[PDB]
Enzyme design. Structure first.
Site, PDB file in Angstrom:
ATOM      1  N   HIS A   1       0.807  -1.073  -0.054  1.00 43.67           N
ATOM      2  CA  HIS A   1      -0.167   0.003  -0.104  1.00 43.67           C
ATOM      3  C   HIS A   1       0.715   1.062  -0.057  1.00 43.67           C
ATOM      4  CE1 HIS A   1      -3.897  -2.028   0.967  1.00 43.67           C
ATOM      5  NE2 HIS A   1      -2.964  -2.934   0.919  1.00 43.67           N
ATOM      6  N   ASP A   2       2.018   1.100   0.455  1.00 40.51           N
ATOM      7  CA  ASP A   2       2.982   2.426   0.202  1.00 40.51           C
ATOM      8  C   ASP A   2       3.419   2.438  -1.185  1.00 40.51           C
ATOM      9  OD1 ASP A   2       4.506   4.561   1.198  1.00 40.51           O
ATOM     10  OD2 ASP A   2       6.307   3.304   1.411  1.00 40.51           O
TER      11      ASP A   2
ATOM     12  N   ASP B   1       8.022   5.590  -0.668  1.00 37.26           N
ATOM     13  CA  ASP B   1       8.468   6.791  -0.020  1.00 37.26           C
ATOM     14  C   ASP B   1       8.144   7.131   1.260  1.00 37.26           C
ATOM     15  OD1 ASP B   1       5.693   7.388  -0.555  1.00 37.26           O
ATOM     16  OD2 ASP B   1       6.347   9.201  -1.583  1.00 37.26           O
TER      17      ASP B   1
ATOM     18  N   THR C   1      -2.433 -22.047   5.485  1.00 38.84           N
ATOM     19  CA  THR C   1      -1.175 -22.036   6.213  1.00 38.84           C
ATOM     20  C   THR C   1      -0.739 -20.538   6.440  1.00 38.84           C
ATOM     21  OG1 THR C   1       0.030 -22.590   4.168  1.00 38.84           O
ATOM     22  CG2 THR C   1      -0.839 -24.106   5.485  1.00 38.84           C
TER      23      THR C   1
END
Ligand code: HEM
Ligand SMILES: *[C@@H]1O[C@H](CO)[C@@H](O)[C@H](O)[C@H]1NC(C)=O
Ligand SMILES: [Ca+2]
Ligand SMILES: [Ca+2]
Length: 343
Positions: A47-48, A68, A196
């Site tokens: 998500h960054d 960033d 798992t």
């Protein structure tokens, strides 16, 4: 360079990350476990990073700057974007470590996702490069995929972000092998993507291929479709990437093929980590990341969980038949929930 602890690295600036390592292994990953906080830190990288858009740069300019640290720097702004649901807590947890060690937010997010993965058995040997300057502006919304986007939308988004093709889209989704969802089903948190979630293996790719028979918790939730296993959640984008003609044979290629899983994900994860960066201006501190552990028993790498067999497979790859896996012994089970992190 010999650090103060006696371990050798290429660049002495890397020596500081040993202290970061010790601090997060103990105080964020509970002694280096592949559990909720490890899973949350792997998710944060994506998500960054993916919030970058050359396309947008060319039109309505600032498409975001990739890897960033913007999602942490401008967390009140970015984690309110609906595809970033639940990450305000993950950023809240990581932020103290960035603030006390004085490392950039970008490098810490990259560091913590590499370390989190070294805690999961079967993980590739992860890389870590430092050198991400702090974002000066938040990413626009609309850049992180939703579980209810179409296959064409995701392929286009990823392609724009870093020129990733749809085979690479399948590779980075390998991360749903050590993952749970807290926010799609409003009645229960921590429903795993596969049987798992503390093991980096191809069960995510085996199990999304079963015909959907049940909802694990409530039904009627946006972005969720039936899975074929109790306790397991299946989101719609994963469901249809498993079946779509563009990605179906690549989805299936991972089944029973650990070396492909690992070498492809080692590659693709480092690429996410460098979006918006110049690799040739970064410092390699891969020497700090601890060695990944093998998957521990003497089992088949991929299998059908108890109570599933080849008849449950929805063959979508037309060129190659789904492999013949063993079915593990016993009646059908319920995959256990991983409770999300406190605060
Ligand atoms: C097409 C893109 C993707 C979509 C639509 C998607 C969607 C989702 C959704 C809906 C969740 C649960 C979020 C919540 O309930 O708060 C999830 C969790 C997660 N995703 Fe993805 N995902 C995608 C790509 C990726 C990629 C490329 C990675 C990173 C390498 C990734 C890693 C994870 C992890 C590790 C989690 C679990 C987080 C946790 O246990 O707290 N995802 N994803
Ligand atoms: C795994 O994938 C690689 C790369 O496509 C391939 O060369 C290899 O034969 C596959 N391994 C198995 C066990 O099929
Ligand atoms: Ca960013
Ligand atoms: Ca797994």
């Amino acid at each position: 360079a010999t650090c103060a602890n006696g371990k050798t690295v290429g660049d002495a600036s890397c020596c500081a990350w040993f202290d970061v390592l010790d601090d997060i292994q103990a105080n964020m990953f509970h002694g280096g476990q592949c559990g909720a906080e490890a899973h949350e830190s792997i998710r944060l990288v994506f998500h960054d990073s993916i919030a970058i858009s050359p396309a947008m740069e060319a039109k309505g300019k600032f498409g975001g700057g990739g890897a960033d640290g913007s999602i942490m720097i401008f967390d009140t702004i970015e984690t309110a974007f609906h595809p970033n649901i639940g990450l305000d807590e993950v950023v809240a947890m990581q932020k103290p470590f960035v603030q006390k060690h004085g490392v950039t937010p970008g490098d810490f997010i990259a560091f913590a996702g590499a370390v989190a993965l070294s805690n999961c058995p079967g993980a590739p040997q992860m890389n870590f490069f430092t050198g991400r300057k702090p974002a000066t502006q938040p990413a626009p919304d609309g850049l992180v995929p939703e579980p209810f986007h179409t296959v064409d939308q995701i392929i286009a988004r990823v392609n724009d972000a870093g020129e990733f093709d749809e085979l690479e889209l399948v590779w980075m989704l390998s991360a749903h092998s050590v993952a749970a969802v807290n926010d799609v089903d409003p009645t229960v948190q921590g429903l795993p993507f596969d049987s798992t979630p503390g093991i980096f293996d191809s069960q995510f790719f085996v199990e999304t291929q079963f015909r959907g028979t049940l909802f694990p918790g409530s039904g009627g939730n946006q972005g969720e479709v039936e899975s074929g296993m109790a306790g397991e959640i299946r989101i719609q984008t994963d469901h249809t990437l498993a079946r779509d003609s563009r990605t179906a044979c690549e989805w299936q290629s991972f089944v029973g093929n650990q070396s492909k899983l690992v070498d492809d994900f080692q590659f693709i994860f480092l690429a996410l980590t460098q979006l918006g960066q110049d690799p040739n201006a970064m410092t390699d501190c891969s020497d700090v990341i601890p060695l990944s552990k093998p998957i521990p028993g003497n089992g088949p790498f991929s299998f059908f969980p108890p109570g599933k067999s080849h008849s449950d497979i929805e063959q979508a790859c037309a060129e190659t038949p789904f492999p013949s896996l063993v079915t593990l012994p016993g009646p059908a089970t319920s995959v256990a929930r991983i409770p999300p992190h406190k605060a």
